[PDB]
Amino acid sequence: YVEFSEECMHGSGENYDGKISKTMSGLECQAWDSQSPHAHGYIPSKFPNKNLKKNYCRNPDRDLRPWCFTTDPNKRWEYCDIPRCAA
């Protein structure tokens, strides 16, 4: 929408529902329900509570920060960098 966005996330952001399909490295994210040749067992149907849809960055592990699978065979999954609140 705009070039200069101003927002913040809650710590790790396990409840992150923001729309973004790119990693912190600017890599394209793979769809969770896709079937490119990847090694994984993260089926959206197994975690419907975390709202896994399309190819948007999500965090079903509740780790340090949201990540996503890449469509590049050179990489498996990469983290996403989102501005977090100070407190």
């Binding site: 040749p37 090694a39 067992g41 993260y42 197994k46 079903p60 592990d61 780790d63 498996r76 999954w77």
Partner: protein
């Protein structure tokens, strides 16, 4: 055909995922997260050495 180069590796991980999928899915999802980062170290030389 498909990518069946890591047939043994995939099977091991799958068997573990299937077993843990019961209730240890929370642990499984975390374990895989820490193991896959190590896979980048192993598969780096492993996939390079293994032609088939």
């Amino acid at each position: 055909g498909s990518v069946e180069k890591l047939t043994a590796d995939a099977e091991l991980q799958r068997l573990k995922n299937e077993a843990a999928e019961e209730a240890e899915l929370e642990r499984l999802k975390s374990e895989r997260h820490d193991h896959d980062k190590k896979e980048a170290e192993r598969k780096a030389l492993e996939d390079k050495l293994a032609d088939y």
